[PDB]
Structure formats: C-alpha cells, structure tokens
Design a protein around this nucleic acid. Sequence first.
RNA 1: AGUAGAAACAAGGGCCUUUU
Lengths: 36, 537, 541, 50, 686
Amino acid sequence: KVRLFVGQGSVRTFKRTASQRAASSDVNKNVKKIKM
Amino acid sequence: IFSFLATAADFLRKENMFNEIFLPDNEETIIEMKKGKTFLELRDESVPLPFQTYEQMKDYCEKFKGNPRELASKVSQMQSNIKLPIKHYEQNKFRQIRLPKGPMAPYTHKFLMEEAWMFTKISDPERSRAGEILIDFFKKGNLSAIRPKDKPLQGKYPIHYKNLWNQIKAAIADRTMVINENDHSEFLGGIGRASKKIPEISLTQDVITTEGLKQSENKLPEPRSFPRWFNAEWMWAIKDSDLTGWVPMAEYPPADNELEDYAEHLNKTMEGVLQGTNCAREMGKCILTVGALMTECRLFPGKIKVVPIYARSKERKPSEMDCLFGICVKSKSHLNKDDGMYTIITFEFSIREPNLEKHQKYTVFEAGHTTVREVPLYLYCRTTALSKIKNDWLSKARRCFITTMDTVETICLRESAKAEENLVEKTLNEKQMWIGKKNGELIAQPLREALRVQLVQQFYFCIYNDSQLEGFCNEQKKILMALEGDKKNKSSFGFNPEGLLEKIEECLINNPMCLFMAQRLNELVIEASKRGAKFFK
Amino acid sequence: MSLLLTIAKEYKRLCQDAKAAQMMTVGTVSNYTTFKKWTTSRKEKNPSLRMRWAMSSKFPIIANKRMLEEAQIPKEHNNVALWEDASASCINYWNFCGPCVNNSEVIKEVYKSRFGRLERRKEIMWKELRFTLVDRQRRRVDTQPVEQRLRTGEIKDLQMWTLFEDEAPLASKFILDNYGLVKEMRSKFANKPLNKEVVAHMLEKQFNPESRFLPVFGAIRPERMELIHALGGETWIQEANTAGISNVDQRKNDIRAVCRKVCLAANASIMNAKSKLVEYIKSTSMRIGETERKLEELILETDDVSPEVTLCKSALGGQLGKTLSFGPMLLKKISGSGVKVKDTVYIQGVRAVQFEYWSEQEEFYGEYKSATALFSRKERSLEWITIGGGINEDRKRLLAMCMIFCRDGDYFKDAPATITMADLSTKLGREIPYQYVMMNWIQKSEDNLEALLYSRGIVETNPGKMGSSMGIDGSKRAIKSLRAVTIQSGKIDMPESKEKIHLELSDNLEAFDSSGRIVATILDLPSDKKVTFQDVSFQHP
Amino acid sequence: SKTFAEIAEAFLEPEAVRIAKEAVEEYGDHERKIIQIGIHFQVCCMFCDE
Amino acid sequence: MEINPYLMFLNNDVTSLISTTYPYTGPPPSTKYTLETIKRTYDYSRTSVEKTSKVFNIPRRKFCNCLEDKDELVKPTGNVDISSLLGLAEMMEKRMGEGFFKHCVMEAETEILKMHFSRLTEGRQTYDWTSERNMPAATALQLTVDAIKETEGPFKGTTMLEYCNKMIEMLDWKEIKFKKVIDSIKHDEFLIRALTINTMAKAIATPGMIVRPFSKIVETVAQKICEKLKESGLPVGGNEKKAKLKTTVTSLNARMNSDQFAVNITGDNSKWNECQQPEAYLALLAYITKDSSDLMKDLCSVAPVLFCNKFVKLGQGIRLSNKRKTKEVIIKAEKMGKYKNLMREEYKNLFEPLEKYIQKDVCFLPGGMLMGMFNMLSTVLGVSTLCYMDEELKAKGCFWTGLQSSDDFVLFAVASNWSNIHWTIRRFNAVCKLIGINMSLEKSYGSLPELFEFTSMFFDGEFVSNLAMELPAFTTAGVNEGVDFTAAMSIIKTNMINNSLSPSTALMALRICLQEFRATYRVHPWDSRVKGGRMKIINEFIKTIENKDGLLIADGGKLMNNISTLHIPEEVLKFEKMDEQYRNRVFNPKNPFTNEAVVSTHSFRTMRAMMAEEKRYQMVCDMFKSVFESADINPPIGAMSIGEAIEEKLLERAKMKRDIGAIEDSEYEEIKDIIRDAKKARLESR
RNA sequence: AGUAGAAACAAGGGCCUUUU
C-alpha cells in the first residue's frame, strides 16, 4: 500500500494489485437473473 | 468498489453534481425552493383580476379546456370592431413627397472639394512628416506672401481669423507648431465658454429671481430647402484631377489559378479607373489629414497644435508630388471619454467668388494673387468640430472601394451566368446605365463610367451620415419594393401609406444629401409613371 | 530551487494575511475557477481605435526587465529609445539579429493541422474557371480532415496526460486503451521549452472536426469543404481534382461494412441475437493509420447516419440523431404526428395480412442518391411530393419508395397477383411486413416499379404546369403526368436539429425510439456480399 | 446529455440505468435519482463478483 | 445635366442594387424618453381598474383581462385575454404532440440544477444594488457575494439553486451589510433596490442581479421550446432561416389548390415590448408547468412576478440654464417634483399624471417589457398565432402560415378570392390583437408571391446578401500583429462562404486590411521610402536578411496570400523561405515580449478598494497557477482546500529535488519548516 | 461661436491627466 497525490486536491491510497474484473458481464448476468 | 467510486466521484465533481441534491442521504430527500413570506405576499398580488390567489389561477390553468366556439366568436367580434383597411396601391397611388421650405441647405463637409485650390511641391522621402512638409512649403515664399485684408467678403469674426493666421505664420517661422492662448484663440476655441455648474443646495427663490432660471428651451433644428448646388459638386467629382494615385494602395499578390488572374484583372481595371478622379483626391486628403490630426490629439492635448491639410499624389505617365490644400488647427482635444468633442479650425484656399447661400459657414478673405497668369485669391476660414468616431471612419473611408467593386461584380457575374460565358469586358464597355437627364432625355453611359457615380454615392454616405439619412434610407425601401411590384404587375397593397410618407418627411431637415435624394426619388417615380402605375403627380 | 524557496515565502506571506487565509482554507479547489473571473475583468468597445491610439504613445510595448538584461542587446543602437532602462522597434532588432533558439523545427508538430492544410493545398491541380448558376444545398458537414476524432473529455485527458503528468488525474479507461497515441504525443512534447497552454489549445483544435451548416455543391469531403470558398460560388465554379487527398471515406466505408457483417452474423440466434451482437462487437478491432482501435469507440465517435451504425449505437446504448431510414433511402420528419392503425390486405384471392399505418398529417424530407424530396402524408395517402433532384432514375426510385413509406395506392388494399405467401414472411421464421415485401418487389424488376407508378393516378399536363410535372420516365415535361407530383430545380435544403433521442431495440433488431416508429431494421441492408477486410481483428471463435 | 439517463450512461452501464429508471417510475419519485440508485445497484452486482 | 443615381432601378432588378441604399459605410450616432415610454405603456392598457398593494402602498393598474375603451383598435392595445392565449397554447401543443412541453422542461431542469453560479458573470452589464450604477456582471456578483458573506456567513453554495434560495432568504432579511468607504440598509430599501431596473442608451434595460438567475431559467425554458418549433427563427441565424423559408415556400406552392392563390406580408410589429405583459407569461408558464415537479413550477413562477413589480430608474434628470446660457444648473430625478413649476408645459403635462406612481428616482411599473429581456418567450407567444385554424377558414378554403422572429414576421396567406384574402388578414389581425400583439400599418406591406423581406434580408427568386451589415467587420480588432491579419482573413473567408462575397471584393478588402495594418503599427515595406527609425534599421539589416520573400509583413514583408490561401496564416506559408537565423530569432520561445493563430514575438502585452480585492484574488490565482501548470485549461476539482494542495505539492516537489535535484538537506528542512509555520499560522489565524 | 440629437459636449481634478 502507498498514499499518493492524484490530480488536484486529491490524496488517495493505491495498492499494487491488478483488480479490474469485467463490470458489464457481471451486471448483465445479475440483471438476467432478476428476470426469473 | 473503491475504483468504481473514485471514477464516479471524479465524473460528478467534473459536472458540478457532487452535492446533496443529486447525492442526498435518507432524510435530506426533499429539495424545494425556499418560499419566503414576502415573495408569496407579492405573488398573491400579481394574479389577474378574476383570480385573487395564485392557487385559483393555477387550478384554472392546469385544467383549462378548449372551447373553440367562444374563441371564434370573440375573434369575430374583434374582427368586426376593427375594420382594418386594405389598400391596393394601383387604386390608391403614392402622392409625391413634400419637401420642407426655406433657405438652401449649406455646405457642411470639413474640407472644400470643388473650390479648393492646391499648391504642389516635389516629394522628399527624407522629409515626410506633416510639419516637415508644411515648413518646406512655407520656405519657398509663396505662402509667406499671403496677407489677408481687414474687410472680409462675408462672414463674421474676421479679426480673430486674421490674428490667428498671423500667429500661425509666426509659429511656422519659429519651427514650433504651438499656439499661445490669447483672446482670439480663446474665443474661437471656446476655452472658457462652458457654463459653470451651480449647486442646488446653494439655491433659493432669491437666487432664482436674481438670474433667470427655467428649463432649457431645446432649440430643435430648422428646415432648409433643396440645395441647387449639389449637382455641380457631383459633376465636378466625376472628372479627372490631372493627377493619379491620390489614395494609397497595397501591392497585388501573386497568382496561381485562373480565378485569381480574373480577380486581379478586374481589380486592376477598377483601381486604374478610380485613381484619377477628384473624389479620390478628397479621400486621400481626408485619410492623411485626419491621420495626422489623430496622432496629434493623442500626443499633445492641451496644446493648440498646427496641422496641415495636405495629400500625396503622382504625375501622370514620372515623379511624386506633395499637395497643400490648406491649414488646420485643433483646440484642446482632451478626450477623456468616448464620443468626445474638440473644436478645430480650417483655413483653405480658393480662386472662386463665394456664394452667399452655399458658403454661409465660411468667412472668406481676399488674399492677393497667385500664378498658374495671375489670379485673385480667397481665404476660406471655417470653424468646425469633430470627434473620435468621425476621425476613425474618415481615416477608414477607403471602405467605399469594397462596396463599389461588389456591386460591379454582382452585375457582371450575374450577366455572365445567364449565358454561361465570361461576359465582363463586354458588360463593362457596353452595358448602358442611365445616370441622369439632359434636355428632357435620359442620359446613359457604360458601367465603366458609372462606377464614378457609385463611388461618389458611397463617399457622400460616409461624409453626411447622421440620424436623418439613416431614417430616410430605412423608410425609402418600401417605395422601391412597391416599384418592383409595379414593374412585374404584382398587385401590391398596403395599410396606410400616408403615415409612411409622413414618417419620411419628418426626417428631412437641414441635410443636403437627404433632400437631394428625395427629389431624385420623386423624379424617378415620375419618369416611371410613364411606363408604370401606383404613383400620383 | 531558490525559486521554490521564494514560492514558499510568498505562500507564507499570503497565509499571514487574514482574508486570503480564510478564502484558501474554506471550500474546495474549484473556487479558483470562480475567482479567475472576479479578477482582470475589463473589455473595450472599439479595440482597433484603442490600439492605434496606444501605438502612437512614446513607449507602447511592455517587456520584462530580466529578459532584456539577459539578452544584453544595446539600449539604443542608433539613438532609438528601445527602452527607458519599450518601443516596438526593439522587436525588429531582435528578429534581424539577436539570441537564436537552438532549433525551430518543433513548430511543424505544434501546428500540424495548418501545415497539413498547406500540404494538401499544394497538391490541387486547378482545371478551369467556368460560369453557371450553381445549385447549392444547405446541409451540415465537417470542414476539417481529422484522424481519431474524440470527445472533449478524452481530449482533456490527453492534454493532461501528455503535458502535465505530475498533476494527471486518476487513470481513465481511454488512456489505458489508447496508449500508443498518448506515447506518440508525449515523446514530441517532452523536455522541451514551450508554452504549454498554446500546445494544449492546438491539440484541442487538432482533434475537433469543425462541423458547420453551409451551402454545398458536388462531393462532400472535408478536404474540399476546408477551401470550398475557392472552388465555386452561386455563379462560378473553379474545377479542381481533389480525390486523392486525406482519404477519409475508405475507413468509414470499411466500418459500415464491418457493422453490416456483424449485424448479419448475429441474426442467426433468434433467442439471443442482441447479446451475441454485443459480444461480437466487443471482441473486434481495426487499425487506423498506425494505431489499432476498438470498434465500440469508433462507432461511438462516428456520425454515419446509416442503419448499421444506428443499430450498433443502439445496442451499445449510444445516443444518435433523429434520422429515420427506409432501405437505401433517408428521411427526416419535419412536422406532424400520428398513431398506428391496422388494415388487412388480401395477397391472392382471400388471404388476410395485417399491416399498420399511421393516421395524421406528416411532412417528411427525403434523400436518395442525387435526389431529394419534401413529401407529405395524411391518413394512408400521399398528399403531395416536391422533388428537386437531377436524375430521372433516382427521381423515380425516390418517388416509389416514398409511396411505399406511406402505404398509398390500391396494391396495399388489393395486393398484386405476382406476390406470393412464400415470400411474404418467415424467411427465417420472422414475419416480414408488407411494405418491405413491396420494396423487394420493386427492386426485383423495373416492370413492377412501372406498375406501381401507374397505380398513382395519371392526368393531362395542364398548361403552364408543364415544367412542374413528371412523367413515368421522370421527364421534366410531358403531355400526361403523374397526379400531384410537383417538380422543381434545386436540391431541397436539408433540415437541422441538435437533438439526441435514446432508442432501444427489440429481440428482432427493431429499433424503437420512445414510440412505435421503427427507425431501422436488418431488412433494409444489402442481402449479402463477400469482402476481405484488411488490418482487422475478429478475435471470436 | 440533455437528460439524466445520458449522463448516467457516461459511466454507469445502460442496463443499470434502465433498471433504476423503472424503479423510480414504480415508486413515482423524481428521475433526478436515476444516478444514485443506479450506482447502488451497480455496486451490488459488481460486489457479488460471481 | 441633372445626375440621378436611382435611374438604375428603372431597367435593372431592385434586389441586385438594394445594397447601395444602406449607408453602412459611415459612422452611426435620459428621462423624457423614459417618461414617454411609461406614459405610452399606461395608455395602451386601455383599462382603468386599479388595485392597491399593501407592501408598497402604490396603486397597481391591472394589464390583463380588463379590456375597455374599444375605440380605434387599429392602434396598439396592451390587454390580454388569458383564455385566448391558453387556447392558442393548446393548439400548438396538439400540433407538436402529446406531452410536448414536459420533455422541454425536463431538458431545461437537466441544466438549471447542475449549473454553476459563475455563469451569471457572462452577461451584459447589470445594475448594481450597492453603488447604484451599471457594472460588469462579474464585479456585481463578487460584490453581492461579499455582502452576503459580511451579513450572515460565507456562501458555501456552488450552484444556481442554492443561490436562488439565498436570494429568496435575503428578501426576508431585515438588514443587509455591504462594503463601502460599510453602510447598512433596512428591508424595504433593499426590496426596492433589488427590483430597480436601470437603462443603457446603446435603449436597453439593466435588471438587478437578484433577478438575473430567474430570467436565465425562464429563457432556458423558452429556448428549449423554440428550438423544436419549425415556424420560428430567433435562435437560428444566417443560412438556417433561409433554408426554412425555402422549404416553407415549397410546401405552400404544393399545398395550395389550383383555384387558390397565395399572398405574402412583410410585417414589423410595433411597441413589441410595451404591449407584452408578464402576467400572460406567468399564466402561460403555469399552464406549461402543470405536470412537472413543483420545483420548476415555483422557479419559473418567480421571474414574472419580479418583472410585474419592477421599478424603473429615471436617469440624469433635467438641466436648467439662463437666457445667455452662461450659467447652468443640474438637477436629478429625485428633486424633479420640487421644481415642478420650472419646466416646459409639455414636460409638466407628461410628469404630473405619473407623480402618484413615482417613488424617489423611480416609477413603479406593474407591467410592460423592456428590450432584450424576454425575446424567445415573446417569439414563442407569437409563433402560437400562426398555428391557429378554425372551422370558418376551412369552410371558406383559406389558411395562413408564416415565420416570425422577434418583432419581425412574414405571413403567407392563401384563399380563392381577394374578398376572402382581406377577411383572412383581418381574422389574423384580430387573433393577434387578442393577446396584445399588434401590427404596424405603415412599415408593414404585402404582395403577390416571391417578394418579401425578413430581418434586413430581401427575398425574390434569389436572396441578395445584404453585405452592408458585414462591412464594419472588415477592421483590424487591434490586439497584436500576429492575430490581426489572420483574423481579418478568417472574417473574409466566412463572409465569402455565407454572404456569397465575390473574389475581387475579397481581394480588395484584403489589400485594404493589409494597408491599414501597415499603417497602424507604423510598418512599411522594405522597398518603400517611408523613412523612420524602424524603417532605416530594417533597411540596413535587410541587407543581412538574405531572403526577401520570407520577410514577415510586420518586418518589412510582402503580401503572399490570396483567395486560395485565406485558410493559412502567413507565418506558415513563409516558413520554408524564412532565413534560418531570422526564423530562429522570430520563433525563439523565451523572449521578453512572449484563437487560430501562431504565437510569435510580435505578440506583446503593451475605485481602489475594489482593486484591493482584485489583487488579492489575482495573487491567489497567480500562485496556484505557479504551482499547478494546468489550472486554466482543466478546472480544478477535489476535496482539499487551496492551502492543502499547495502544502502537499510543494512538499512533494521539495522531496523530489532533494532526492536527485540540486537541493541540500538544509534547504529542504528550511522550506518544510517554513511550510509548517505557514500552515499553523493559516489555521490559527482564522 | 461651434457640434448633434430627440441629450450632451463646449476639459477634469487638486501643479498634474509627430512619419499611410
């Protein structure tokens, strides 16, 4: 973990682990389930 | 979750939607205009007469239903209690415009055009400044011969003008173009003839009695009859000046395509034709003299500088030439504000006797003799006024070339397209344009010679522009459209032409151009009545 | 360095104050923008006069002292007041002789747009000026050839991530996706002495296709529209060949072909056509010049008003223009309203087939190849049509497709004998309405088209109206002509509206737009064709 | 971008937009909240992470 | 001979020469005017019904639904029948479609909410309710926000709605403070001062800053409505309305039957503003806002009442003088009543009837409109009339359409006989009279097809571009050397594309602009002989400058630009030739002096209490830009305050430069200690 | 004196506010 200034007037915290799952796929699946 | 939330907050902060409004909590879920006691107290007082509270008006409007029977009945009842007149012009013709009555309109342009007599001297590139030219002209000694007589031919305040002329000559002799503040300069420049403000807190009925006090009795302008001398100026301005290249110009650029060659050939022809006239001499005289006066009022305000009335030209095919039409001076031009006011004074030469009706403004002084043989002289001493805006526009009077070229190429391209061939030289040389009447007949001359008339028209629009000419040229369009309708047998009509003519005749006062153009418009409708309708004699 | 210490001392001095401290402490940083307006607010009515006024002044110019001292340029080389201790003349001295920058070849990259303009203009072979009354149509177009056209948000991120990285915002999706463009821009403008704001503004102009509503004649290509002023006016035409400059039509054409291919693939799945289409779109890309771009972003950026793109934009959820379609034809509703109303049509003897027809007055602009129209319908009848095209065949085809659009004519009441129930519907288990059947009928053979035109009443060309009349072969004038078919000269000006409508699509690829209207369908595309796509990636089994 | 739904589709997936829209219509509340509810719904679906 | 220039109209088309009439080649060119306007407004309202308000205790004439004195109706009447107006609104709604207005108010509400309150700064001059003077929008906004801050507490709001709710609260407040060389004012004086609308003599109104946001909201609704309508042309300009007219005329010539024959009428409404009432606008906005959120209902309802209660300031008063005019007294409007005897009979007759309405240096006006305020809402109200259609017209086979913009319209009537044409026109006049909209009988005219006029654009088979209107544009703005010539060329290009300017006219204007450019900056060609210090230095050093062609126009250059190269600045065409040393010096990035333009050396930069605040904001912004180099292009956003951002960024920069760059641990510690001290001082101070 | 319009200027503050 590490804190870091980002852009302007934003201090955030970043962790060096790639976590970008598909958002579209999961949302679509849940929406299809909602129709049963 | 945290990456999604970060992106979302960035995309909200970007749009100014990161507030409670769009992102409220559970409780703060009721956003509403903060209705105040006074705002309601007023809104409940603006509701129309039938209603007495905004609630009734809203309840009546939200449920409003259409009843076309009542609406149509009311429309017909309003259509009957009106009786809108409709007047086809063919039956109800346009009576001739009535022009005001009184003495002839007098000359008003700053610098004499027709009368003005000029002195030439070979150009010196090194000495190109205004003062440098004036000094060089003074040194030959022809200028120093002038010695006006005490008695003027006409006009008023002679002594002041004579004293100022002597003072100017002394200034130039000293090579310092600064005039001192004396009684004559003070009176002509009105240095102290500005009414002094009186406070109201220091006022009393006794003070009112001691000196009369009443609301200013606004002295509206007075009416002046048609000028009989304008035609002479036009005809003179449509003649060559024995010199060419009076107005400066840029250098034509290269060319790559046929279109550019055509544009450059037409522009060359028009510029060559238009550079030899006299109107263009006045364009040059205005551009240079006002440029100098602009660059003096900017630098030396509070000092009554001396500026010449001059121009630069070129002998026909050769050397160049500096001309000196006259001399000007400018009283204090302390232009603290836009659209200011600063009196100037203009001396100008002539070889002609002054008309009483025309040259009412001027105060001439016969001044010895001049060679060409010997001829008498006449020193025309005016006292006019100018502003910033008039200065800038006169200094940008070169605009007229654009308009004239646009009209000429709007006629030539249209005539060429109907035949699908380059018909410009033929149109220019041959196409006949009526330019007046002589001996009861309609004179006509090719376009190449009516460019001069068009240019003079645009120049005079620049010179005599005022509210009157604006209103006139805005209200005459209806008549021209009616004329076109008559030409094509389109049964035009109107509701109240008499009011239109009244509006027009209201804006005809003491401005030669308006009056002259109106008389010409009447002569036009008359000549067309022979081949058309909708106009009375 | 020491400058840093000066900045810190300045900050300390400001914070020592009370008011500045308050305004800095309170609120967020956005307040800066606001404050940026409360200061330095002053304009002038006539700037030209003011400039002439000021230039005359003894010392009009303003110059920093440290720059002049560093330059070590004479104070007055020849008794000229360059500065007290500045005149305009000073600049001349600098230009003619003075400190020289190491190289000025970077300017060609900063203003790549204008150098591109000059480079394109140098390759135009001018043919011949002619004179004639040119027919000009007022339509929206684009006047700047641009590669990889983007939106303002992407452009803003591109500037920040190419100039100010230390103050870059959190990494966006676009920046990750399009890293070759960011790298290319970064390399040229990194570690360079430059006015950063100027470069940013020029990159903004670089990526913005200037769209304008102008009169136009001839082909429509940005390469011409940028200099249309020097090609022709209302009365003249300067012929010139501009075909081979900044080809932008081949990539648009390829994009439309790809959308057609994917839309035709994804019609097989009756149950899951939509999902298959989206998956097919996402798992595909294509190369543009040097970079490789994802098809979805290209579709979002594009402005091709075509059923393929319209459908894809709907599927992804992109909003699109208020533009209808009917086959290879274009439409635009100027006015009117209506509501669906079913009516039967007997195909052969007695075979009822239902078809829906609107019921209200409705004006419609139309546009087929080299032809245009402004027709109107009313309660299942073509009220009138005014054409301003220039080709006989395009005129006839436009009129026929318009008649079909409004389901006018007897054939809709009593179908032609030729058409059969096999072709009426269910080519692949999906019903095909009557109108598209008639469209296929007319395309199939010219004779059917002639029969359809005959269906509309024919009258005798009255006197005077001879010029405003159209025969069966699209004649300008004849002795007998189609009923209520006005004709004029000059293309009908295309309307305009800056509106954005959300529209969904059905399981059968029927794009609804918040009302019954069918904006587009898969049954208004070329049947099929084989193509070899270059520099494309169909990463799907 | 003249209506809220377009602004939500800028970052939110259009499906969640349609969902929150239907939800607002059923409740009858202002549509200005199409964004907030959409965000919440997305968080849950993404939260699940299959 | 007697030369006459009009004779060219005898045998040549009138449009192809109408430009010659416009005197646009020359320079163009209180209380009496305002009093006459007030009187005409109170007269047009034909009724005499007067209520009495309690807040102001001023008789309030009601200009709606009280029509009387139906004499000489031809003249302008300012009474409105809300029933008729609502019926016309229903007709327009029906034609457009179901729920036509809800989508519009939705598209407006989508913006009114997220709008930043700094947008108000971009507007014409607005009256200031503190100094009682006209002032640019930004200064007035800053002044009133400082008054708010001094009164109760800093305005934390950042959006339009918060600002409006704070104005509504400010109306209630008994006292309001505001800075001055710091007077305080009671509720009633600020209540009057908020509504007060000044005037500028360019005439045109100047409403207070309290009313500006509500006006923006109403205008935004009117705009989103008008843009949809195809029978209006106010938002659009140039080509768009011409294309509209062409489509309209085609539709007309197609619809009309053979028996039917069309007519046109160029109309120019009169007293547009004087006869429009904001109460009809109030009712109309209520009808439009019948289904949408109550929020838009109130927000829209606000501006009409404010305008229906708007005071109007009398400016500069009368001037007194003696016979010789030596002396001269000045008197303001407030004291006019005292010296009522000392005025001309006409001025007294005009003033005396309004004394009851008159309040100190103001005259309460319960209605009327002023120039520029509600252009698009009146345009909508007037387009409503064209839609009208009734049984009688269809029975007689008559129908009228048209195209109206603000106070200027075009009408297209159709019928089968002139006896019916006249009746149709009278019907139109009546329906327009029912809602105040009048028509001038003198300036308005008609004719058979294909001869009309609309906003100074004359129409026939063709449409002659006026060109006169665009002549003033052919001037050098006067910003700098690089910008001026390119801007002029771009103006010429636009005029060529739209106003169908000819090529030779373009070349002449280009040469004229180049010569005025050479004259203003006191520059002249190298080969010319306009001696000057600049010119002499140029000439000697031009021997050193090897390439004559590449020389810049400002540096004794020559014109290398034409019709086919107007879309390319000179700096670009001459780049190749430009001498290497000359090019390097000309475009050296760092120099003392150093928007489709190139940035070169030629670019040069050439009531105090307020200056103090301006310098404070200037310093803050200046040093925030000093730290952050991307402050202007991309508006900052975050949760940190300015101080916190500066603190952290400065510390990070110091650490980066101590790590590698030329800084010593001593220097880094000194700077960091300074920063800590500054932070402590800032927080502790206030 | 003069300008122009439907009112304003005819300097204002305490000594200051040359190249078409």
